[PDB]
Amino acid sequence: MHPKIFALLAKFPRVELIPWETPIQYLPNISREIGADVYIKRDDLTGLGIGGNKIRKLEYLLGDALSKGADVVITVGAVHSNHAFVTGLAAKKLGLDAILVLRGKEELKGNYLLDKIMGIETRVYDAKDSFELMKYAEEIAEELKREGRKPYVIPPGGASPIGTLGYVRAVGEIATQSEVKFDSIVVAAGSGGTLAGLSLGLSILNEDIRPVGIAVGRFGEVMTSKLDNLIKEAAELLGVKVEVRPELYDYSFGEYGKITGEVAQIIRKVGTREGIILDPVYTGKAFYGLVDLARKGELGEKILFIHTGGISGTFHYGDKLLSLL
Amino acid sequence: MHPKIFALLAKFPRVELIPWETPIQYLPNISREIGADVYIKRDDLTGLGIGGNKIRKLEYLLGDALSKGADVVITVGAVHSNHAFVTGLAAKKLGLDAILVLRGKEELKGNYLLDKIMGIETRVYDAKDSFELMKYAEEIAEELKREGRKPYVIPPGGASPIGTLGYVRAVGEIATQSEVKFDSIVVAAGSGGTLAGLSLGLSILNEDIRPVGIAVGRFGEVMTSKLDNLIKEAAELLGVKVEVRPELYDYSFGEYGKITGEVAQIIRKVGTREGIILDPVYTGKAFYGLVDLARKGELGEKILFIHTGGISGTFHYGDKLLSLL
Ligand SMILES: Cc1ncc(COP(=O)(O)O)c(CNC2(C(=O)O)CC2)c1O
Numbered sequence: 114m115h116p117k118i119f120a121l122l123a124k125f126p127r128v129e130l131i132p133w134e135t136p137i138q139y140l141p142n143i144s145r146e147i148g149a150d151v152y153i154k155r156d157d158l159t160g161l162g163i164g165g166n167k168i169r170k171l172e173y174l175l176g177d178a179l180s181k182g183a184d185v186v187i188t189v190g191a192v193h194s195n196h197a198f199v200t201g202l203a204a205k206k207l208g209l210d211a212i213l214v215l216r217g218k219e220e221l222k223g224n225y226l227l228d229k230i231m232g233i234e235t236r237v238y239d240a241k242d243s244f245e246l247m248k249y250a251e252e253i254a255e256e257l258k259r260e261g262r263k264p265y266v267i268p269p270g271g272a273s274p275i276g277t278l279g280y281v282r283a284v285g286e287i288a289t290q291s292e293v294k295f296d297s298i299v300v301a302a303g304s305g306g307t308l309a310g311l312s313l314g315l316s317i318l319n320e321d322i323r324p325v326g327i328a329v330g331r332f333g334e335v336m337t338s339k340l341d342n343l344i345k346e347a348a349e350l351l352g353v354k355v356e357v358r359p360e361l362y363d364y365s366f367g368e369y370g371k372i373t374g375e376v377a378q379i380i381r382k383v384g385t386r387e388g389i390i391l392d393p394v395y396t397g398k399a400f401y402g403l404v405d406l407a408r409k410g411e412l413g414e415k416i417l418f419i420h421t422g423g424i425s426g427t428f429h430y431g432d433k434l435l436s437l438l
Numbered sequence: 439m440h441p442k443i444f445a446l447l448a449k450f451p452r453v454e455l456i457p458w459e460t461p462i463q464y465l466p467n468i469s470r471e472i473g474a475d476v477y478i479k480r481d482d483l484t485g486l487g488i489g490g491n492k493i494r495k496l497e498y499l500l501g502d503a504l505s506k507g508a509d510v511v512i513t514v515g516a517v518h519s520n521h522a523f524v525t526g527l528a529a530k531k532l533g534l535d536a537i538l539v540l541r542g543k544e545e546l547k548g549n550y551l552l553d554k555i556m557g558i559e560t561r562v563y564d565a566k567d568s569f570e571l572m573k574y575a576e577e578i579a580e581e582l583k584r585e586g587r588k589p590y591v592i593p594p595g596g597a598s599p600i601g602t603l604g605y606v607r608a609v610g611e612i613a614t615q616s617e618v619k620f621d622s623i624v625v626a627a628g629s630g631g632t633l634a635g636l637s638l639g640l641s642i643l644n645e646d647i648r649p650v651g652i653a654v655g656r657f658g659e660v661m662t663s664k665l666d667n668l669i670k671e672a673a674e675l676l677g678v679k680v681e682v683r684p685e686l687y688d689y690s691f692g693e694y695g696k697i698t699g700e701v702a703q704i705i706r707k708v709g710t711r712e713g714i715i716l717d718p719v720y721t722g723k724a725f726y727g728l729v730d731l732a733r734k735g736e737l738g739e740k741i742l743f744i745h746t747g748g749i750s751g752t753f754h755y756g757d758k759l760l761s762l763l
Pocket residue numbers: 165166189190191193194195196197269270271272301302303304305306307308395396421422423424
């Protein structure tokens with residue numbers, strides 16, 4: 114925790130869901146190949162549930178929630194959505210209820226398989242992949258509010274200014290430990306909170322490190338414009354200026370949830386050469402978009418890849434992955 | 439790292455696969471329920487593969503295979519083996535080839551999926567019996583080796599004297615990262631290689647921390663003879679004497695791999711109350727026993743439960759689980 118950042122987060126009521134600072138490891142092989150030293154930060158060992166990037170976010174969201182006397186959080190995401198599970202399982206630990214408004218092929222495997230095991234409540238609605246279940250969440254929060262039950266709705270991937278503070282803290286932690294001075298930091302980009310917080314923070318530490326987000330789906334206008342808005346409201350939350358938005362390379366292969374022989378080979382590669390697993394929906398496309406850039410000489414000499422968990426995907430869509438190797 | 443265990447481990451050739459000390463957290467919700475303080479050591483976040491108690495042993499094993507110049511590493515295990523997967527991958531990471539002599543269903547899930555995904559070679563001998571799948575392992579080596587190739591065979595669960603130094607070193611770490619004094623430390627016992635070294639390190643350390651393993655499988659015979667003989671052939675290696683035995687309780691619920699309704703429940707509870715996931719064949723069973731004994735005060739006021747991993751089996755069997763809740 115960096116002096117300044119601490120000082121700026123200390124006002125926000127957060128729930129402490131993590132005990133240790135997750136490790137930053139160096140990857141010998143992917144460095145020899147690609148040709149750059151790439152370090153990986155195990156945010157997938159954040160510990161709660163299947164771990165991952167969300168846990169850090171839940172700390173400021175559910176921290177908040179347990180304030181506004183909420184007693185039943187709602188969230189959204191894919192049916193395989195890690196965040197959805199982790200937000201759910203987390204909701205329950207802090208002694209709260211949780212309703213997941215999922216969307217997709219009802220498959221009893223992966224995170225949806227977990228969702229049940231843990232008994233988290235599940236509600237699916239075949240609807241515009243635009244993640245517009247975000248409206249089903251509300252009707253749901255309305256009627257529950259019409260019962261005197263105080264809910265708490267969470268935005269796709271905790272893409273909330275307050276959940277954003279999640280990585281804003283993660284940058285301070287990356288600064289207390291890092292022995293390496295990074296030129297760029299990669300990380301998949303789903304809803305934009307990881308890039309936001311990570312960016313709001315860097316800017317706060319005013320570090321000459323480049324915030325590189327590896328888009329993994331939509332992008333059009335929304336993903337980059339809305340990205341900027343998000344990181345704006347966040348700063349206005351911390352009451353500070355912005356130091357020009359990050360980078361954002363699309364490596365989604367066209368559509369979210371697409372599993373290609375490239376997202377697939379890079380899985381077996383990182384796994385069989387470094388001994389770390391990444392998934393075919395998030396982390397796998399971003400490590401793949403890590404090699405691409407590090408070979409085109411676009412990342413610098415020292416690069417840190419923030420592993421964001423998602424371990425359930427590799428099991429969920431393990432069948433496709435096979436038919437591709 | 440306690441100075442005594444540091445000196446005693448000094449001369450043994452290891453391969454550093456673990457960059458940090460795994461965190462120890464207090465489980466308040468489960469502690470307020472069994473009437474005892476229960477602390478969980480997160481060894482399920484060791485780093486390699488799906489993490490687990492095995493990565494530790496693999497530091498010494500693979501540093502035994504290497505010191506001998508091998509090109510193919512062999513090991514056995516049930517098709518759902520956490521050891522067998524993690525062994526090969528790890529072997530593959532050290533640039534060593536790996537062949538797994540599994541036994542059981544060719545189902546495509548759990549660690550069988552991960553195996554094929556990460557392209558580890560696999561020989562599923564329908565010889566569904568016990569560990570006499572080791573005679574098949576050694577004969578594959580005879581053929582293999584009458585061709586310059588230098589195979590290296592690792593016992594079931596990598597439970598060999600020097601693979602046992604993995605947790606000897608573990609108590610050594612524990613003994614330090616902890617500002618608590620436990621009455622007992624519990625760890626699942628399958629092939630018993632973990633419980634084997636744990637007893638060693640607590641024997642050398644010498645406080646009154648009891649080694650408490652809860653058998654996950656039909657608490658066999660060779661098992662009790664094997665267990666002792668492991669513990670001491672290693673005491674001889676460090677040249678230390680074996681204080682006196684470890685405690686072993688049967689909680690197999692009938693047999694190795696039996697998923698009963700109490701196992702499913704212990705996963706739901708720990709999952710939705712502590713935010714930690716256990717599997718149905720190993721850790722879920724071990725923690726179930728830890729409770730059952732702490733309730734009756736049989737395990738002290740301060741218990742340390744080592745989470746040895748196994749997360750794969752929870753996806754591998756999340757259907758049986760579902761038909762139990
Ligand atoms: C493994 C993993 N890596 C990166 C991301 C990034 O999300 P953000 O862009 O919102 O930070 C997710 C997203 N997950 C979401 C989900 O629905 O599961 C969007 C939240 C992720 O799960």
